[PDB]
Amino acid sequence: TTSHGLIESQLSYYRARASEYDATFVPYMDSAAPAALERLRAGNIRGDVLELASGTGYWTRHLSGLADRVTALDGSAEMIAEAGRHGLDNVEFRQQDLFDWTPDRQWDAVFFAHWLAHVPDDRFEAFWESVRSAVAPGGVVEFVDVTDHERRLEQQDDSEPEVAVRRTLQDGRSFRIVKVFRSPAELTERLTALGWSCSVDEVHPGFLYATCRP
Amino acid sequence: TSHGLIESQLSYYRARASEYDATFVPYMDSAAPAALERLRAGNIRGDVLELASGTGYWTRHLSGLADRVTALDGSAEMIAEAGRHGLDNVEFRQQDLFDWTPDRQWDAVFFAHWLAHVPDDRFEAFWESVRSAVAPGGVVEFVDVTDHERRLEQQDDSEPEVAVRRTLQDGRSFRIVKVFRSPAELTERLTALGWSCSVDEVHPGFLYATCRP
Numbered sequence: 001t002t003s004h005g006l007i008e009s010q011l012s013y014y015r016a017r018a019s020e021y022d023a024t025f026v027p028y029m030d031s032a033a034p035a036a037l038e039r040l041r042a043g044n045i046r047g048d049v050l051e052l053a054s055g056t057g058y059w060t061r062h063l064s065g066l067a068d069r070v071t072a073l074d075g076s077a078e079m080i081a082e083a084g085r086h087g088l089d090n091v092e093f094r095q096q097d098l099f100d101w102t103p104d105r106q107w108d109a110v111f112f113a114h115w116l117a118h119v120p121d122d123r124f125e126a127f128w129e130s131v132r133s134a135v136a137p138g139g140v141v142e143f144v145d146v147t148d149h150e151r152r153l154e155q156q157d158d159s160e161p162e163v164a165v166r167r168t169l170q171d172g173r174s175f176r177i178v179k180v181f182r183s184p185a186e187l188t189e190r191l192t193a194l195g196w197s198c199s200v201d202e203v204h205p206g207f208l209y210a211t212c213r214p
Numbered sequence: 215t216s217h218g219l220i221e222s223q224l225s226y227y228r229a230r231a232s233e234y235d236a237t238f239v240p241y242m243d244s245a246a247p248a249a250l251e252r253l254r255a256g257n258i259r260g261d262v263l264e265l266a267s268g269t270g271y272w273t274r275h276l277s278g279l280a281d282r283v284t285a286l287d288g289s290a291e292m293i294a295e296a297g298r299h300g301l302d303n304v305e306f307r308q309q310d311l312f313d314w315t316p317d318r319q320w321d322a323v324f325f326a327h328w329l330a331h332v333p334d335d336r337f338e339a340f341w342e343s344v345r346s347a348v349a350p351g352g353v354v355e356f357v358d359v360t361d362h363e364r365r366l367e368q369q370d371d372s373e374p375e376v377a378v379r380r381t382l383q384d385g386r387s388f389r390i391v392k393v394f395r396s397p398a399e400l401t402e403r404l405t406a407l408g409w410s411c412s413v414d415e416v417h418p419g420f421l422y423a424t425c426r427p
């Protein structure tokens with residue numbers, strides 16, 4: 001069970017971090033981006049695209065050049081304000097808490113970068129049900145995230161794994177968030193059991209890219 | 215790091231002793247030939263000190279390479295298991311390694327999968343004791359788990375919980391220390407304590423180190 005207090009802490013961390021977010025971005029994402037981009041540019045991101053947890057809009061920029069229309073959901077109005085600065089004409093932002101979310105449309109593709117590791121085990125399944133209902137017939141879900149090597153989990157052998165890590169902002173405020181590293185095989189297996197077909201690959205050391213078809 | 219976690223960890227290994235070999239260190243069997251090429255580089259010779267010898271898996275190798283082995287472990291149960299190997303040149307002694315100041319020196323000190331059980335607040339004192347046990351010209355070598363260099367910053371955790379919970383067949387459950395350290399991280403920390411170190415990932419998830427006092 002992941003406490004609701006961890007989940008609120010994570011969203012406030014990002015709320016408060018939003019204005020200094022780009023000063024640090026996601027560690028080493030800038031090293032892994034061309035490798036991830038080879039997958040993102042493979043052609044499945046097109047038509048009407050949904051982006052979840054769009055943050056300050058780094059991925060939203062790429063999604064915007066590939067798609068006709070982008071709908072981009074983030075839990076933080078602050079993040080949405082920062083992303084607004086990129087002036088992307090074909091993008092609508094909506095504030096939305098992703099742990100309390102029932103889509104009412106469908107899109108040709110759904111994309112998220114570094115969101116899934118902030119979804120704890122006990123919410124993973126309801127989150128993936130809503131994504132499933134968000135994807136149109138013929139569409140895919142793609143995402144980027146951190147990964148670990150397949151054997152690490154057994155090397156550690158922890159029956160009660162630490163879901164959380166603690167971060168610190170420029171001004172010294174301290175917040176715990178969810179950070180679950182999942183291997184490509186562990187993700188593939190779990191999503192396969194929820195009815196998805198998945199191609200999940202480490203495309204650069206420490207990063208994976210996934211394509212999942214409902 | 216509470217005294218309680220230290221004690222819990224030693225109790226875990228004391229109880230696991232009889233069934234340790236049934237499971238061994240996860241994937242060490244995959245890495246062992248890569249670790250053995252370093253173990254046979256020639257530095258393990260003469261009078262050798264092994265720490266946390268456990269059921270004697272590495273002791274057998276050191277026994278074949280050295281003239282004499284002194285092997286230390288906190289668990290009398292582990293020592294009795296290692297006795298079944300019948301190693302003629304090895305002396306076992308029971309020793310709590312968090313309260314240990316050697317009285318003599320050896321040509322080489324070795325341990326496998328011990329350092330990850332030493333939490334950051336006991337690190338320095340453990341290395342002070344090790345340093346005083348190495349003779350002039352000797353080295354310390356060790357094998358352990360590791361991570362790629364970037365994982366720590368990807369995770370970016372201010373207050374790393376170092377504890378993990380293990381549960382034995384019979385249902386008894388224990389907390390132990392399990393700190394993964396990359397080669398660079400270990401290199402920087404030991405250099406700062408005066409050691410000069412060659413630490414390498416020799417098989418994915420495993421490192422081997424050679425350290426000179």
Ligand SMILES: C[S@+](CC[C@H](N)C(=O)[O-])C[C@H]1O[C@@H](n2cnc3c(N)ncnc32)[C@H](O)[C@@H]1O
Nearest residue numbers: 011014053054055074075076079097098113114
């Ligand atoms: C771990 S993701 C960081 C990735 C960043 N969007 C990027 O795409 O480069 C952090 C984003 O998740 C958002 N977030 C955190 N909790 C949320 C929640 N419960 N619902 C929706 N968004 C959430 C934060 O607002 C932030 O934009």
Ligand SMILES: C[S@+](CC[C@H](N)C(=O)[O-])C[C@H]1O[C@@H](n2cnc3c(N)ncnc32)[C@H](O)[C@@H]1O
Nearest residue numbers: 224227266267268287288289292309310311327
């Ligand atoms: C992390 S090592 C496990 C693998 C084993 N070292 C091997 O050589 O393959 C566990 C060994 O360290 C020992 N140990 C745990 N705490 C100790 C302590 N405080 N002092 C000495 N030995 C300790 C246990 O008895 C056990 O044999």
